[PDB]
Amino acid sequence: INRMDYVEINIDHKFHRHLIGKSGANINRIKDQYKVSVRIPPDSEKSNLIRIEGDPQGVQQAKRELLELAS
C-alpha cells in the first residue's frame, strides 16, 4: 500500500493562505519544480503542519526549502 516518502513542516503564522495566495499556486510551483507532493492543510489545530511527500531528493529538498526559504 503505497511506498513513497512523506514529512510535515511545523508552521504557525498564516503561512498557508500566504503560500497559496488567494486560490493556490505556490503548491504547484514546488510540486512541479521538485516533482513532489506538497499540500496546504486548511486547518489550525494548535500547531500547523504542511504535508510534503514524494520520493527522491525532491521531497526532502523541497521540504527543507519551504521550511527554510519558504519561497
Give CA angle at 44 (42, 47), nearest 5°.
125
State residue 9 phi and psi, 5-degree precision.
-110, 125
Contacts 24+ apart (CB under 8 A), 14-19: 15/48, 15/50, 15/70, 16/40, 16/41, 16/42, 16/48, 16/50, 19/50, 19/66, 19/70, 19/71
Cell numbers placing 62: 523541497
SS3 64: helix
Domains by residue range for the chain, with CATH: 1-71 (3.30.1370.10)
CA atoms of 53 and 23, how far apart (whole Å): 21
Spatial distance between the Cα atoms of 50 and 41, rounded to a whole number of angstroms: 6
Q: Which of 46, 47, 50 is nearest to 20 (CA)?
A: 50
Q: At 31, list the grid cell.
A: 510540486
